[PDB]
Design a binder for this molecule. Structure first.
Ligand SMILES: Nc1ncnc2c1ncn2[C@@H]1O[C@H](COP(=O)(O)OP(=O)(O)O)[C@@H](O)[C@H]1O
Ligand SMILES: Nc1ncnc2c1ncn2[C@@H]1O[C@H](COP(=O)(O)OP(=O)(O)O)[C@@H](O)[C@H]1O
Ligand SMILES: Nc1ncnc2c1ncn2[C@@H]1O[C@H](COP(=O)(O)OP(=O)(O)O)[C@@H](O)[C@H]1O
Ligand SMILES: [Mg+2]
Ligand SMILES: [Mg+2]
Lengths: 166, 506, 51, 472, 473
């Protein structure tokens, strides 16, 4: 019973990893190892995302997946299995990573950047999503207010448009 | 102009109240908007075919709810909508305003007024998709729908709650016979007996706006717009609007049907609705069936049409009469959509260009035009009275079977051929000239006695007008007797025979 | 005269719609981007007070 | 603990349900969804994968959301079976459409049952006198067999089947079942009214016929499974009750139409003429359960709708092989004024054998068939050249076949709405005698009109005398 | 301001995919520019593919497009210059002049994508447009404020028919006319432009009361699609802002649907019947509803529908039939026998054929002409098989009379003198209705049917009969 549905379509790998972790343990350890993987990937751009091309034989994909295996086996948990199965499957590995962090975010942090008319970003770290969103919005309107690009209120234009058209 | 002021104030106050109490969080964000449809992620609590409001103002409706994303068909152009736009679910399945205030107004698929005559006064809101009445609530069609044309009334009568398909080729008189049926109701709608009043609902799906303007002005001239309802689904309007407009008009007619009133809804075109729904399916990623038509065009047509029925006395004795159309391609009756709709409707009315240019002005193809309730749903004065009026259809089929191609056997065959030719000569009726049953019956009777000695076939056109005038002068007693009583007595038949002999003598 | 008056109502509605552009431009140059933000923020606070 | 699932996708008439437990419901099981409008039933059709099952909705999918609670009944759709169903209208889910209260049936059998084995295939060649001249002459119906009413839209299938109910249903003696599959709801209403008038349905007492309706207003799943529901009712009557059954299915083709309908969205590659790939399979699975076993006999009459009047369409063409007695209603003969519209040529039955109907019956039917075939071979030659060019024997054959074709038309009691002539019950022996007399040339002088819309040869003589009297 | 730079990600034939950043997505049908070496390439946003990627349709050739090339957003849809300045100028889909007469100094550039004027229509379909062609002036009268179809397959003579329409009408019309030339021959456009120039219809140093649009079938599908839209923008600006009666002229409205199907084949859409685009009805209605009378001004449309494979049941010709007040179906079979124009007399049809608008006399004449022609077509089968002898005297007389009328339907056109070899004739409506009334009464039964071949009025019939009887015989 994963906290949030990725609905498959390139997102099944993240859900499978989360289920494998939730079976025993390592909801976090595998996740910081995966974050280290992504950091190593972005550290070398020409060598970290060009290598994820489909035009790559299985042997060289395996050599790459040993390549990320480095720095005192930071690869821990079932992440190694994810790279192993990705070598024999769809190669490039960023969106399922983002799906993994989003799933764990819904699992333990439960934040979302709503506000309807407000074009703000009030991220909240709390599972009880009843009233703390109001506190987050109050903090966001209090301090920060960097852009506040509302891009014209929609109620005014909508009401005017229905008024003139009858 | 205080009215625009207070309506603007009320609408803006309602907007403020909605903003104060909205708490919309699971509202969706558009991923990919195609050609008049958008796929949106979110709306985890969206109902299927539930209306939604995009941030740009274009309304939508949810056909396919895939896991994660749902397909929203747009009730308008995709100019305004863009990727990442907020969508606001209305929380209710798509519906249309219904009530008696819709009369005298022209509305779009959603029921919004498009005639520029002000806001729509609706007694309530009825779902666009409403389950058809069951086996028991219906009642056998017995009350006729007076079309006002000789051929269709005599050969293929339409009754209250019946579904008669006006199937035909391009510009063969389909909307024309629809219009004569529409206009003939002014005789009873101007009265007081609601049991005989028959409110009208036109469905202009796929027709062009100029044609709809022609329609509304034509109804205006012949004092008919007051009791008729125009649901226009312009071809330029979004395909979902064309798909939905007949359903909303069906709900509008069901309002009259469930309140003890009789409603005639003419599903004119409905092949344009078929192709619009084909477009809906073919951009909604639904694989098609036959000739690229989706799977449920049959289910769509049947579900839409079955809403038209004659309710029982326990349900108010109301009725809802359907007059759908099929635009065949080159007279191809044996095509998927045509035979599909024919299997739905309680009979069909076939019109081809062959009879249209051959002279038959209603273009009534007596062969493939059949009504599923012959004796019932017909005027008693016109059904059988003298017997020949009942096997009128069989006599026409015989005349077709032994037409001029067949060898003229003997004097009996010559008489039969003359009778058939005079009868098909009589059935021609000028457009916008609804001819009432009190005037139809004497003419049909004259087609059995005194028909053979007509002076040239071409002169029967003026002979009919002269016979009407004759029945008007010191014979209006007979006309009102056959109009009011409904049945024809033996003395009435003798009087009609005497009048026919006196006229044919002159 | 009736449909002339109807057309007159349509024309006055159209002229109000024409003046709507000047109405919009009135607030376009108005430094409205501060009071509106505060009002919508307090409206959001009131909205979430019930929830 | 009930098995619970959640709605994942609602694609038109099919709903995708995911179960969070390994105990997935089996195929054809009934899934229950609580809805404000009532109760929605879902029948499992496919196991998509990842604990997700693809189901077909029994009712409309109005107002369904992704996440609706889905309850598994633990078995297929169960409908009431027994004497309680007699005189009651049955929905696709066994519910009583008429508000006569719940059905107090002590047994509820699933609609999906195995067809009877080849061992229990008791077959007979008993004649069934339906009173229709064509049927008793050219395509004899078999008691306990399967009867087909093939025809296009507006050709006469519903009228013809109503005529069978009026004729044989009243005098059947046993328990018969009518199954309205994807048909006109008003047609079902007039059928209900007609059986109420004829007394075979007695609301306040005992009725002999069970009413099952899946009219076209129902969603495709209901149109597909209502035939199976009425079938299960008839099977319970045949086996457990040990009674002769007349399973009247009106336009069985709606089942295959709904199967092809759901197949496209079920991720199934369409077959020829845009049909479901499995059309023969599920259609035969339905048809075989309609059969006469050693425990009872089912004299089923099934109407078949041919799309575009095309008799080569895959559904009716394959349905032909599942049917003992065949009655084809073509639009062409109906266009000539023959209201029964039964084309005498392809209307064939297995009972047309000298060892079953008798040598004289076979000889008369064969002579009629060759006369109509000689007529049909002379369509174009007469139409484009003229009847004068034919030989004297050919002219005699043509005129006799015209007289025969007119004589095929018979007044149906339920057809007085169209003919205006009271219906006539022409007996089998009367029909055979009349047609052998006509084939012998005894009534060559009688005009062709006297054979139009008549009963026996005595009716032909009476009509000829009346025509002569009025002609003077 | 801040330019909106997009990167090309896919070039699928005439369809180009462009990827943008966050909150810079152009809307559907926006115009996008790329600085190609040969000039500028305009992209119309057909779909939003998500992930900030837009599926676009090319206005010109996609050769030389490298993935990742910078894409500039114009901020709106394609804008074509409008006003009396565009009169006498030749413009392609983009809006730039292609007449090599300098840039168009138009004050406004209305977008090619506009909403229909809704219910601002009028039921003024009661004014007969006298075109001079006797068959359409009798069988299918044209509406001054309506839409004319002018159907036909390959050959048949649809182009000469429309050209004759301009020659008879636009020369003496009270207003401006717009020709779009949607997916036709470029040589045909050059010839027809030269023809207007010779007649003074387009005077370079003068009034030049006609605006020309082009971008013929040599252009990619996106062009052929949107050239109808830009011509409609011209017509609508003349119709509303100028308040003038406009003579639209579309040489092949079917080519728009052909281009729509072509782009849909690459738009990732499951094909419709006969492999057309599913939205064929929707785009076709959006196209045709911009051609409406409207409260201000009026439009005459005048279309020309090409039926693929001479199939009148093809989805696009079937769809366009609804959006046409009057149609003129040209049948190839009639073209074989030589009666020119090849318009089918009993397949053209017109809403204007009613006694209220016509006058109950011309209406009766047309009805009897249809009577004779329908009887002739019904009897063709036995005429071929058996012959005229088998028919009775009435049927024989009807067949001979119908043959005479069908021959009389042929009319020489001034734009087809090189083909007929006979000077063109412009027959007035009263003249032709009187002539056909006289023919229907049998006053000219003795005259041979060949005297009705390539003639104008009944006086020309008498003259030709006399010449054949005396000089030839
Ligand atoms: N009495 C009549 N019945 C039918 N059609 C008529 C009659 N009188 C004239 N017509 C002509 O026949 C045409 C009917 O075609 P219509 O009903 O408009 O079909 P569609 O709406 O499919 O084009 C009209 O354009 C009209 O001009
Ligand atoms: N025996 C008959 N007598 C008179 N009319 C008949 C007869 N059979 C068929 N018809 C005609 O054919 C039509 C039959 O329609 P019906 O059979 O109910 O539709 P379907 O063929 O789709 O079942 C009726 O309208 C009726 O006029
Ligand atoms: N008025 C006319 N006189 C003689 N021939 C004509 C006339 N109008 C058209 N045609 C014929 O039209 C044919 C092809 O015309 P056109 O319409 O240009 O072809 P398409 O329809 O394929 O574009 C030519 O064979 C020509 O003879
Ligand atoms: Mg019409
Ligand atoms: Mg051309």
């Amino acid at each position: 019973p994963p906290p949030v549905r990725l609905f498959g379509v390139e997102g099944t790998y993240a859900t499978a990893l989360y289920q494998a972790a939730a079976k025993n343990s390592s909801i976090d350890a595998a996740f910081q190892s995966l974050q280290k993987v992504e950091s190593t990937v972005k550290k070398n751009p020409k060598l970290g995302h060009l290598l994820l091309n489909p035009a790559l034989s299985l042997k060289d994909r395996n050599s790459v997946i040993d390549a990320i295996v480095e720095t005192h086996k930071n690869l821990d948990g079932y992440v190694v299995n994810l790279l192993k199965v990705l070598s024999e499957n769809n190669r490039l590995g960023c969106f399922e990573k983002i799906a993994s962090d989003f799933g764990v975010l819904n699992d333990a942090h439960n934040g979302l950047l709503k506000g309807t008319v407000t074009s703000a970003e009030p991220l909240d770290p709390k599972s009880f999503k009843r009233i703390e969103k109001a506190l987050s919005a109050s903090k966001l309107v209090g301090q920060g207010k960097s852009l506040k690009l509302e891009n014209v209120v929609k109620p005014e234009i909508k009401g005017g448009l229905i008024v003139e058209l009858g | 102009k205080a009215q625009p002021t207070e309506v603007s104030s009320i609408l803006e106050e309602r907007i403020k109240g909605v903003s104060d109490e909205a708490n919309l969080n699971e509202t969706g964000r558009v991923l990919a908007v195609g050609d008049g449809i958008a796929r949106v992620f979110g709306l985890n609590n969206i109902q299927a075919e539930e209306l939604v409001e995009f941030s740009s103002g274009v309304k939508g409706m949810a056909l396919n709810l895939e896991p994660g994303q749902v397909g929203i068909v747009l009730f308008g152009s995709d100019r305004l909508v863009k990727e990442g736009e907020l969508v606001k679910r209305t929380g209710n399945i798509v519906d249309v305003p219904v009530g008696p205030g819709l009369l005298g107004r022209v509305v779009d698929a959603l029921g919004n007024p498009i005639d520029g005559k002000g806001p729509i006064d609706a007694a309530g809101r009825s779902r666009a998709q409403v389950k058809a009445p069951g086996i028991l609530p219906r009642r056998s069609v017995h009350e006729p729908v007076q079309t006002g044309l000789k051929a269709v009334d005599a050969l293929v009568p339409i009754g209250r709650g019946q579904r008669e398909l006006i199937i035909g080729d391009r510009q063969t008189g389909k909307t024309a016979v629809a219009l004569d049926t529409i206009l003939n109701q002014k005789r009873w709608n101007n009265g007081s007996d609601e049991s005989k009043k028959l409110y009208c609902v036109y469905v202009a799906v796929g027709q062009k706006r100029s044609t709809v303007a022609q329609l509304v002005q034509t109804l205006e001239q012949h004092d008919a717009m007051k009791y008729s309802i125009i649901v226009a689904a312009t071809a330029s309007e979004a395909a979902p609007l064309q798909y939905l407009a007949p359903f909303t008009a069906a709900s509008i007619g069901e309002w009259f049907r469930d309140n003890g009133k009789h409603a005639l809804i003419v599903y004119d075109d409905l092949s344009k609705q078929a192709v619009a729904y084909r477009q809906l399916s073919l951009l909604l990623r639904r694989p098609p069936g036959r000739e690229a038509y989706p799977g449920d065009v049959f289910y769509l047509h049947s579900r839409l049409l079955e809403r038209a029925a004659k309710l029982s006395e326990k349900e108010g004795s109301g009725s809802l009469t359907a007059l759908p159309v099929i635009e065949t391609q080159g007279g191809d009756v044996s095509a998927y959509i045509p035979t599909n709709v024919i299997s739905i409707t309680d009979g069909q009315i076939f019109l081809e260009a062959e009879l249209f240019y051959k002279g038959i002005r209603p273009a009534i193809n007596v062969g493939l035009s059949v009504s599923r309730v012959g004796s019932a749903a017909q005027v008693k004065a016109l059904k059988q009275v003298a017997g020949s009026l009942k096997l009128f259809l069989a006599q026409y089929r015989e005349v077709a079977a032994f037409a001029q191609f067949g060898s003229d056997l003997d004097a009996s065959t010559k008489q039969t051929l003359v009778r058939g030719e005079r009868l098909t000569q009589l059935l021609k009726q000028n457009q916008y000239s609804p001819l009432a049953t009190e005037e139809q019956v004497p003419l049909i009777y004259a087609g059995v006695n005194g028909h053979l000695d007509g002076i040239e076939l071409s002169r029967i056109g003026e002979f009919e007008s002269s016979f009407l005038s004759y029945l008007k002068s010191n014979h209006n007693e007979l006309l009102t007797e056959i109009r009011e009583k409904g049945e024809l007595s033996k003395e009435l038949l003798a009087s009609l025979k005497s009048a026919t002999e006196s006229f044919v003598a002159t | 005269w009736v449909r002339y008056e109807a057309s007159l109502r349509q024309l006055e509605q159209r002229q109000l719609a024409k003046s709507v552009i000047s109405r919009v431009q009135s607030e376009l140059g108005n430094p409205k981007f501060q009071e509106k933000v505060l009002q919508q923020s307090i409206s959001e606070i009131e909205q979430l007070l019930s929830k | 603990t009930p098995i619970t699932g959640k709605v994942t996708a609602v694609i038109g008439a099919i709903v995708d349900v995911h179960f969070e437990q390994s105990e997935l419901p089996a195929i054809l099981n009934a899934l229950e969804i609580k809805t404000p409008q009532g109760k929605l039933v879902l029948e499992v059709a496919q196991h998509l994968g990842e604990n997700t099952v693809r189901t077909i909705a029994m009712d409309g999918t109005e107002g369904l959301v992704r996440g609706e609670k889905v309850l598994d009944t633990g078995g297929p759709i169960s409908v009431p079976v027994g004497r309680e169903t007699l005189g009651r209208i049955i929905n696709v889910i066994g519910e009583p459409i008429d508000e006569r209260g719940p059905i107090k049936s002590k047994l509820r059998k699933p609609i999906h049952a195995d067809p009877p084995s080849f061992a229990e295939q008791s077959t007979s060649a008993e004649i069934l006198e339906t009173g229709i001249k064509v049927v008793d002459l050219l395509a004899p119906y078999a008691r306990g067999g399967k009867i087909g009413l093939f025809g296009g839209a507006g050709v006469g299938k519903t009228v013809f089947i109503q005529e069978l109910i009026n004729n044989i249903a009243k005098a059947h003696g046993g328990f018969s079942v009518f199954t309205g599959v994807g048909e006109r709801t008003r047609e079902g209403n007039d059928l209900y009214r007609e059986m109420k008038e004829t007394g075979v349905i007695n609301l306040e007492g005992e009725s002999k016929v069970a009413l099952v309706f899946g009219q076209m207003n129902e969603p495709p799943g209901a149109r597909a499974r209502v035939a199976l529901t009425g079938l299960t009712i008839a099977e319970y009557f045949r086996d457990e009750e040990g009674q002769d059954v007349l399973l009247f299915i009106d336009n069985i083709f709606r089942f295959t139409q709904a199967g092809s309908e759901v197949s496209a969205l079920l991720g199934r590659i369409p077959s020829a003429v845009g049909y479901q790939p499995t059309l023969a399979t599920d259609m035969g699975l339905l048809q075989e359960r309609i059969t006469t076993t050693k425990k009872g006999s089912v004299t089923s009459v099934q109407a078949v709708y041919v799309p575009a009047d095309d008799l080569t369409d895959p559904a009716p063409a394959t349905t032909f092989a599942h049917l003992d007695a065949t009655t084809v209603l073509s639009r062409g003969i109906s266009e000539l004024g023959i209201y029964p519209a039964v084309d005498p040529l392809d209307s064939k039955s297995r009972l047309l054998d000298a060892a079953v109907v008798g040598q004289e019956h076979y000889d008369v039917a064969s002579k009629v068939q060759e006369t109509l075939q000689t007529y049909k071979s002379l369509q174009d030659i007469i139409a484009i050249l003229g009847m004068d060019e034919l030989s004297e024997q050919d002219k005699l054959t043509v005129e006799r076949a015209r007289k025969i074709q007119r004589f095929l038309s018979q007044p149906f009691a339920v057809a007085e709405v169209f003919t205006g002539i009271p219906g006539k019950l022409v007996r089998l022996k009367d029909t055979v005698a009349s047609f052998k007399a006509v084939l012998e040339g005894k009534y060559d002088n009688i005009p062709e009109h006297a054979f139009y819309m008549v009963g026996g040869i005595e009716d032909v003589v009476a009509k000829a005398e009346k025509l002569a009297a009025e002609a003077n």
